[PDB]
Each structure stands twice: as structure tokens, then as C-alpha cells.
């Protein structure tokens, strides 16, 4: 067999990677952070409650102004919230109600949404006609859209359930770069602060560092054991966290190319649905299937806080660009600021 | 002064909540349905490229919204969680190379025992009983070789067959129903109930069956709000 003689080099390269990563594994993140001061109990209280949505809220994204946030709910509504005054700025009716992701552009002028329709709908929030209308529909994806993030006003990276991530040009409406590395449904992507590389977590228990401009997969992180449903870059741009169904969060590194930390607990046997760092990356706020969030210590790996004010599964959470608020969307149609 | 832009914002929220209130009426009145087949189960004929096919139909002034996942891959473990808030999952079974019936039994097993589908009832539609009608009465054993417990199985005496229907198909027709019920009577827990039917992709009451079955789901959901059942 020739294909079996082709996997001879693949497993030899895998064992070479498993041995190359062993040389860099001279210590552990707990070994370097064993003497640091623990952050103690991080207790956050619900400051706002966005109860405008009807169905379960699947996704949410903060604006770079740290005040306006957009949320996606399975009822077909993309509501832009003024987190300071709880006043709904917009109520975008979606063509397809089964939206699984929404992205707030850094410019604040555009917003996105995607889901089972396999189409990313870019809505212009600055319209002189009087209504928020579809600016461009991206129907190139062959699977459901699980995550999408804005690079520019005309660039947006949308991951999809077809094991493929894609880079889009909103003007032409065509894929400029297609990432076909993952073997499972890509559930979440996360852009780096430089917006030149992004990591995508898929159902293959592996996370891949994708170069946006070159279109190649730089590194692959398969430290997890189940479907990676969540991913979030570290604020420095060199690391990222991954939430999977194995009830474990794992902090990888783009330079060590291996798992640096594992956030696990015997009380937690439920999959993670969303992860997020703080402005300093010290706290790892992760959404769980326990109907509540957990404030993990990225350096100590010990749980430092719990956000238990959600009735149903916390499907999404997000931390502002200034680290002042933490919105946590859940399946109970309620967003809450922590 | 900035209070002139806040009063325009609080009055914009007034228009939004009025739209959300008017949209809350059409959302709760409309019953979302998931038409999920088992491959070549004939789910296309029950309705009579895109990521999902939204189908609209009303029965007795009650609007239903059936959703058929068209361009979705066979890996359903992720996008099936989006259908937690649906009234029912229309499970279409071929009922007749690969053992498609066992694949439907394993798909129904994963759907029934899914932690996010514990409250979602399933309207089981054993479709294509016309094709099954000649697979049992003309030799060509496809239910006995694929299920050895079918030999030691008799038609229930209380079962009601169709007028002019041989017991050989009725035994196989109800054995397929009993195979899916062995999963329902195990993980029911008084939260969701399976509603098996014998559809043929040629009937005219399949939509009426969903209407009558969705009536029991909403009834049993309201019966549990008062802690009656």
C-alpha cells in the first residue's frame, strides 16, 4: 500500500513534533507562576441585564468603543445595545432566524451575522435611508457559520462548519483567502491584536494558527480531547485560550507551540462554550454548560470567580476593549454585564 | 448639553421595544419545526443549495415554521444545539447496501439522549411504507437479516393495522416503531415524548399529524408549567 507508506512520514513528523515540543517543554506555567501572588476571589456582580431578545442568545460581540455591543439570538434579531443605559440602539430583523455568530466591526459602522443559512450578512449601521439594511451577503460558504470577526470595513474572517475558514472582501463579496486545514467543524475564531494572524478552534480537538495574508496554517494545537467550541487570543498576541467539550480550558502559545496550562476542575464536567481574557490577560473568563461563567486565573490555573446569574446555558461572553465590563450572553434570552 | 441626544436615544428604544413586542407576538405564535431526515428518507416529499430551507404553512389558523437543513454536513453534533427551542423535530425515517434503519436508530438515539434535546419532543415519521410494503411480502429480507430480534417478535394484539394489510408488513412496520420506542421509553424522564407515525410520502395528512402532535407537546408543556404531569 502506498497510502500507508505516505502515513509513514506523517506519523514520523507527528512524533518529531511531539519530540520537538518536548525539548521546549523545559518547565510549566505553574512552575514559573508558583511564587506569584494569587489574585484571590474575583467577585463580579450583574450591573445590567439586556432582556430584549426572545429566543436563546447564541453570540455577542463588543464594540471597540467599549459601550455598544451587538447580540445574536435564534429569533432573527440583531440588537445593538447601549450597555451604559440599556437602550436598544438598533433591532435588525434577520432573513434567517438561526444565527450562530455576530461581529461588531472596529469602526462601528458595520455589523455582521451568520448561522445555519451559510451566509454572512453585513449590516450597515450608518444609513441615511432610515433603516439598517444588508450591505453584502457572503454566500460562498458551504456550511453553517459559527464565528465571524471583522478585520477592516471591507475585510472579515468568517469560520464555518464546513471545516473551512474564509477571508472575505465586502466590496467584491468574494473569498480572497480560503483556509482548508481543519478536519472538523470550525466553531470559533479569534483575531490577534495585529489582525495579521488568527487562531480557529474546530471539532477536530485541534486549534490552528492561520496567517491571514499568506493563507497558510502556521501551527496546530491539538492539546484538547473534544470539540473546541471556544477560542480567544491573549491580549499580547502570542497566546490564546481554547474551550472544549472536555470541560477543560487550555492556554497554548504561538511561540512554544504547545499547551502551557490546563484549567480543569473535578466539579466541572461540562463543555465550554465561550472564553475571553481581560485587558491584562490575567483572568480567563469562560462560559460553561453549568449555566454560569468561571473566572479562571491564566497564570495560576485556579478558579478565582464565578458568574452564576444565568438561568440557561451561557453560549457566549465578551470583554470590552478597556476591560471595564464583561457581557455574557446565555440561552435564557438574557445578556448580563459583569 | 448632552441630554438632547439621550432623550432621542430613550425614545428610539421605545420604538424598538414596540417592534420587539409586535415581533414577540409573531414569534411565540409561530411554532418552529426541525425537519431532520436520515439521508434518503424521503423528507423532500413530505414538504410537497441553501444553508437551510425555511418552510411556512398554517393549520387551523396556527402558523408553523418547518426548517430543513439542506447544505449542512452530516456532522450534526454542533448545529443540532440550535434547535433546542423548537416545538418538535420531524424525524423522517426511510423505514426500508448500508443499513439505513440502524443509522436512523443511532441518529434518533443521539438526538433523544442529547443534553440539549432532553426537552424537545420528536415527531417520528416512519416514511415510505409503500416501498416497505413490497420489501416484506416479496422475499428480499431486509429487516430480519438486519435485526435478529425481529424473528422473536410478534405484532401487538392491540395494534391497529390498515385495512387490507398483510401481517408480515404490520409486524415489520411496528417492529421499526418499537425499535425507536425502546430509546424513547428509556430516556423520556417526563420531559419529551416521541410521536411515531407511519407516513408514506404520499399521504395528505402528514401535516395534520404534525399539527395534532404539536398540540400534545404544547399541552404537555403547559401541563408541566403547573406541575400537573
Amino acid at each position: 500500500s502506498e497510502l500507508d507508506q505516505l502515513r509513514q512520514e506523517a506519523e514520523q513528523l507527528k512524533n518529531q513534533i511531539r519530540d520537538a515540543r518536548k525539548a521546549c517543554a523545559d518547565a510549566t506555567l505553574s512552575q514559573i507562576t508558583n511564587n506569584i501572588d494569587p489574585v484571590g476571589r474575583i467577585q463580579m456582580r450583574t450591573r445590567r441585564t439586556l432582556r430584549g431578545h426572545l429566543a436563546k442568545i447564541y453570540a455577542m460581540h463588543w464594540g471597540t468603543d467599549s459601550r455598544l455591543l451587538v447580540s445574536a439570538s435564534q429569533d432573527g434579531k440583531l440588537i445593538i445595545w447601549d450597555s451604559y443605559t440599556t437602550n436598544k440602539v438598533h433591532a435588525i430583523p434577520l432573513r434567517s432566524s438561526w444565527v450562530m455568530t455576530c461581529a461588531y466591526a472596529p469602526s462601528g459602522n458595520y455589523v455582521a451575522c451568520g448561522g445555519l443559512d451559510n451566509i454572512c450578512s453585513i449590516y450597515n449601521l450608518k444609513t441615511r435611508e432610515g433603516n439598517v439594511r444588508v450591505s453584502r451577503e457572503l454566500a460562498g460558504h458551504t456550511g453553517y457559520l459559527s464565528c465571524c470577526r471583522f478585520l477592516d470595513d471591507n475585510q472579515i474572517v468568517t469560520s464555518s462548519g464546513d471545516t473551512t475558514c474564509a477571508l472575505w472582501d465586502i466590496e467584491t463579496g468574494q473569498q480572497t483567502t480560503t483556509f482548508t486545514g481543519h478536519t472538523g467543524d470550525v466553531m470559533s475564531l479569534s483575531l490577534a491584536p495585529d489582525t495579521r494572524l488568527f487562531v480557529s478552534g474546530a471539532c477536530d480537538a485541534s486549534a490552528k494558527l492561520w496567517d491571514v495574508r499568506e493563507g497558510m496554517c502556521r501551527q496546530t494545537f491539538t492539546g484538547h480531547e473534544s470539540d473546541i467550541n471556544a477560542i480567544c487570543f491573549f491580549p499580547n498576541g502570542n497566546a490564546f485560550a481554547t474551550g472544549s467539550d472536555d470541560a477543560t480550558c487550555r492556554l497554548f502559545d504561538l511561540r512554544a507551540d504547545q499547551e502551557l496550562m490546563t484549567y480543569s476542575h473535578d466539579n466541572i464536567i461540562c463543555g465550554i462554550t465561550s472564553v475571553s481574557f481581560s485587558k491584562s490577560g490575567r483572568l480567563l473568563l469562560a462560559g460553561y454548560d453549568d449555566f454560569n461563567c468561571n473566572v479562571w486565573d491564566a497564570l495560576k490555573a485556579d478558579r478565582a470567580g464565578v458568574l452564576a446569574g444565568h438561568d440557561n446555558r451561557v453560549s457566549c461572553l465578551g470583554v470590552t476593549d478597556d476591560g471595564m465590563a464583561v457581557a455574557t450572553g446565555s440561552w435564557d434570552s438574557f445578556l448580563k454585564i459583569w | 448639553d448632552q441630554r438632547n441626544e439621550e432623550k432621542a436615544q430613550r425614545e428610539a428604544n421605545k420604538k424598538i421595544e414596540k417592534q420587539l413586542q409586535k415581533d414577540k407576538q409573531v414569534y411565540r405564535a409561530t411554532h418552529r419545526l426541525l425537519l431532520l431526515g436520515a439521508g434518503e428518507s424521503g423528507k423532500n416529499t413530505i414538504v410537497k443549495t441553501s444553508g437551510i430551507f425555511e418552510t411556512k404553512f398554517q393549520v387551523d389558523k396556527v402558523n408553523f415554521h418547518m426548517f430543513d437543513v439542506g447544505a449542512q454536513r452530516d456532522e450534526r453534533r454542533k448545529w443540532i444545539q440550535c434547535f433546542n427551542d423548537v416545538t418538535a423535530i420531524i424525524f423522517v425515517v426511510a423505514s426500508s447496501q448500508t443499513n439505513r434503519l440502524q443509522a436512523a436508530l443511532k441518529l434518533f438515539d443521539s438526538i433523544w439522549n442529547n443534553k440539549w434535546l432532553r426537552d424537545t419532543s420528536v415527531i417520528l415519521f416512519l416514511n415510505k411504507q409503500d416501498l416497505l410494503a413490497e420489501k416484506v411480502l416479496a422475499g428480499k429480507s431486509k429487516i430480519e437479516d438486519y435485526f435478529p430480534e425481529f424473528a422473536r417478535y410478534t405484532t401487538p394484539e392491540d395494534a391497529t393495522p390498515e385495512p387490507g394489510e398483510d401481517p408480515r408488513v404490520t409486524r415489520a412496520k411496528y417492529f421499526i416503531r418499537d425499535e425507536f420506542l425502546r430509546i424513547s421509553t428509556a430516556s423520556g424522564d417526563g420531559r419529551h415524548y416521541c410521536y411515531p407515525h407511519f407516513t408514506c410520502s404520499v399521504d395528505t395528512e402528514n401535516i395534520r399529524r404534525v399539527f395534532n402532535d404539536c398540540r400534545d407537546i404544547i399541552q404537555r408543556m403547559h401541563l408541566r408549567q403547573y406541575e400537573l404531569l
Partner: nanobody
Framework: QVQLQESGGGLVQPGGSLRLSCAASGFTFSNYKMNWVRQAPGKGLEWVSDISQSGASISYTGSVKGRFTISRDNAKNTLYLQMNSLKPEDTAVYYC?????????????????????RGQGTQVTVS
């Protein structure tokens, strides 16, 4: 990395026997339901047998209800498929497919064409 390297297999005379091992490495055993799926030449991926994370719950497909016997050793992180009375219908690449999520009663996509928690497969031929 979830590594499901299966052992055993080969050409066996009809009415024989075969033991299929599955070295389940890279993940925490005894937490995931272990399944067995095959792919006959010219057919799609079908489910053969599964087993719970504790070994109590055991299921087989109809054709191998009494002939095959699944087994797992949580200590050795291995999965066994004691196949007996092999027929010319059992010639297929048997795959050791793990359940995607742990501590669940639901096992999805074990028979999908593309699945990352499925072993490389053992070419079991019955001739």
C-alpha cells in the same frame, strides 16, 4: 492529540474469529463512549457496536448482535472487538470511533464520512 491507533486484523477464513484492539491514546479514557464502525468496500460508514464509559451499557448492530463482542479496558486505555463466526459480509475496514463529548449519553457523527475521533481503521477481510 486524540490518537486512536487500532490493532489486529487481516484475512480470515469464513466462520473464524478475530480480536480487534484499539490503542486509545491522547485523551482521558473511561470518560468517552467507545464505538466500533466499519466501511464495506462500496458502502457507507455504518455503526457496528458501542460501549459505555463504564462497560455496563453494550450495544451491537443487528448483523453482529450475537457474533461480535465489544470490550474495553479503562486501565490500558484499549478497546476490544471480539469477533467470532466471521461471514463474507463482515469484510470491511473496521474503525475505532470515539464519542465526541465525554460524560454524555449522546454519541453523534460516529458514522460520518469525515470524523476526527475515528481511528485509521483495520482492513478486516473474510475470504
Amino acid at each position: 492529540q486524540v490518537q486512536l491507533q487500532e490493532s489486529g486484523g487481516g484475512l480470515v477464513q469464513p466462520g473464524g474469529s478475530l480480536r480487534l484492539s484499539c490503542a486509545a491514546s491522547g485523551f482521558t479514557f473511561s470518560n468517552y463512549k467507545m464505538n466500533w464502525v466499519r466501511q464495506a468496500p462500496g458502502k457507507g460508514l455504518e455503526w457496528v457496536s458501542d460501549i459505555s464509559q463504564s462497560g455496563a451499557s453494550i450495544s451491537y448492530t443487528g448483523s453482529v448482535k450475537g457474533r461480535f463482542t465489544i470490550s474495553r479496558d479503562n486501565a490500558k486505555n484499549t478497546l476490544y472487538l471480539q469477533m467470532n463466526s466471521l461471514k463474507p459480509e463482515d469484510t470491511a475496514v473496521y474503525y475505532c470511533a470515539r464519542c465526541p463529548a465525554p460524560f454524555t449519553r449522546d454519541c453523534f457523527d460516529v458514522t460520518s464520512t469525515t470524523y476526527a475521533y475515528r481511528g485509521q481503521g483495520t482492513q478486516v477481510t473474510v475470504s
